[PDB]
């Protein structure tokens, strides 16, 4: 066809339709022939002619030969480019809103070449209008289609923010999320997660698709036979987790991210510990579900074969650290994790090489682990309290002085809150008061952090039980500072700091208890107004 091609071109904008169709036909039957090919992606006026004719015409086949010959361009360099310089892409747009299925298929399929081959593609088809067409066509039901189409979505939205706000407006999330719980299709399923695997990092998308039923629906696939399937739910379920907190329905998704756990693929338990983290955050029935089906024990395994991956054993230490407290089976919790020789590996983990954000999550466990009675000794056995005491002196330190991802006010106050707890064991207290905490704790009293202060208070009043140790607090000077402390807004502070006050000075004359008392009373009865100062 090598000049052959424009008398076709004349024929293609004929008037008359018979005569178009009989051009368009043969213009098809060309672009087949790798040799004639080239001929027409190489003469402008003929590739504008065929998409003029596709745009504006009546006929079926006129339309379905047009659509197929642009198709067969998109295969090669120049097929690409001369559709694109000539209008191509808003005309092949056009055509996604065909009532015949073969054009709806050429159309999809060419644009698909566009957009992973050439240059400006994207942005075309965007400004288009293509996404908008797009996510409405996830209504048809060709699973073969409608992997292509939503293939066309995660290459539009990877990266760019506008691209997943239109998709969102569009009811993107409730389309794509029906399509992962109603199709077995294998293809379909993973280009589906991917688009919503990219959409999931978007602030804007995460609670439309979970409000859409996404944590469930990709929970359905997690056990499916595609390995690439399970891992794009799961990448996507860990970005979508810290908005699920209200979801119901979580059972099967929870039990099946427990049994995930014990997965020899590093990736699967470390989604899965993430997942399950930011699921049991502030959810009481994700807590309890989780226990129930051998939660805690499945957490102590993975941390134990982590060994020193804090990828995995910080996620699973958050977890853990969930799982032991605000809900009705924390304290079966709080003694599971030491049933299942957890105990030995937490504490270790506040010792190097770990970093500050896994050595927070661990005190923020042993904290809690310890309002478990049956957890004093165990701990205290595996050198707990010197390891937490030296923790607390090092961060006080460095804040007396000035870390990589966590303020070291946070770790003050952790072990701090941690040793008060510890502390209301009669053995502990001795050998927290006997390592010279008592003028760390002191000085803490000057914090100016109310949650520090509340600790420092609290552990000093564990502490003043005992005679001894009462007298000791007050020859370091705790006095001053826990007398102003009495007018803290925080009466949980202002509490403590009477208590102490009191115990120093349980062996003073009546005369000077007294005058204590009208102090404690002027001070922790708040009347007139709060704020007066």
């Given at each position: ?174 389309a794509l999320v029906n399509i992962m719980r109603t199709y077995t299709y294998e293809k379909l399923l993973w280009t589906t997660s991917r688009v919503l695997k ?336």
């Amino acid at each position: 066809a090598t000049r052959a091609i424009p008398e076709l071109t004349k024929l293609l904008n004929d008037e008359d339709q018979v005569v178009v169709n009989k051009a368009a036909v043969m213009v098809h039957q060309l672009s087949k022939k790798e040799a004639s090919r080239h001929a027409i992606m190489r003469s402008p006026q003929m590739v504008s002619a065929i998409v003029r004719t596709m745009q504006n015409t009546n006929d079926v086949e006129t339309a379905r030969c047009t659509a197929g010959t642009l198709h067969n361009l998109s295969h090669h360099r120049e097929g690409l480019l001369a559709i694109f310089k000539s209008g191509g892409i808003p005309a092949l747009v056009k055509m996604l809103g065909s009532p015949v299925d073969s054009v709806l298929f050429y159309a999809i399929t060419t644009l698909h070449n566009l957009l992973l081959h050439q240059e400006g593609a994207k942005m075309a088809v965007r400004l288009a209008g293509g996404l908008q067409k797009m996510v409405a066509l996830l209504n048809k039901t060709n699973v073969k289609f409608l992997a292509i189409t939503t293939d066309c979505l995660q290459i539009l939205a990877y990266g760019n923010q506008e691209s997943k706000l239109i998709i969102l407006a569009s009811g993107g999330p409730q389309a794509l999320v029906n399509i992962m719980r109603t199709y077995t299709y294998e293809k379909l399923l993973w280009t589906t997660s991917r688009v919503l695997k990219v959409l999931s990092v978007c602030s804007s998308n995460k609670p439309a698709i979970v409000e859409a039923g996404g944590m469930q629906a990709l929970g359905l696939h997690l056990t499916d036979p595609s390995q690439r399937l399970v891992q794009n739910c799961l990448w996507t379920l860990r970005n979508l987790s810290d908005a699920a907190t209200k979801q119901e329905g979580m059972e099967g998704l929870l039990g099946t991210l427990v049994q995930l756990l014990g997965s020899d693929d590093i990736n699967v338990v470390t989604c899965a510990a993430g997942i399950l983290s930011n699921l049991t955050c502030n959810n009481y029935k994700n807590k309890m579900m989780v226990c129930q089906v051998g939660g805690i024990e499945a957490l102590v395994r993975t941390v134990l074969r982590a060994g020193d991956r804090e990828d995995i054993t910080e996620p699973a230490i958050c977890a853990l650290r969930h799982l032991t407290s605000r809900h009705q089976e924390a304290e079966m919790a709080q003694n599971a994790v030491r049933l299942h020789y957890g105990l030995p590996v937490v504490v270790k983990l506040l010792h190097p090489p770990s970093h500050w954000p896994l050595i927070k999550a661990t005190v923020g466990l042993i904290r809690n682990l310890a309002l478990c009675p049956a957890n004093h000794a165990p701990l205290r056995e595996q050198g707990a309290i010197p390891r937490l005491v030296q923790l607390l002196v090092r961060a006080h330190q460095d804040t007396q002085r000035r870390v990589e991802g966590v303020r070291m006010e946070e770790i003050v106050e952790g072990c701090t809150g941690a040793l008060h707890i510890l502390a209301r064991d009669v053995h502990n207290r001795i050998v927290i008061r006997g390592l010279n905490t008592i003028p760390l704790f002191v000085q803490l009293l000057y914090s100016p952090i109310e949650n520090i202060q509340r600790v420092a208070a609290g552990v000093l009043c564990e502490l003043a039980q005992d005679k001894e140790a009462a007298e000791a607090i007050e020859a370091e000077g705790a006095t001053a500072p826990l007398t102003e402390l009495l007018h803290s807004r925080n009466e949980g502070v202002a509490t403590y700091a009477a208590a102490v006050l009191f115990r120093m000075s349980e062996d003073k004359p009546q005369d000077y208890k007294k005058r204590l008392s009208v102090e404690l009373t002027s001070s922790l009865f708040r009347t007139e107004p709060m704020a007066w100062n």
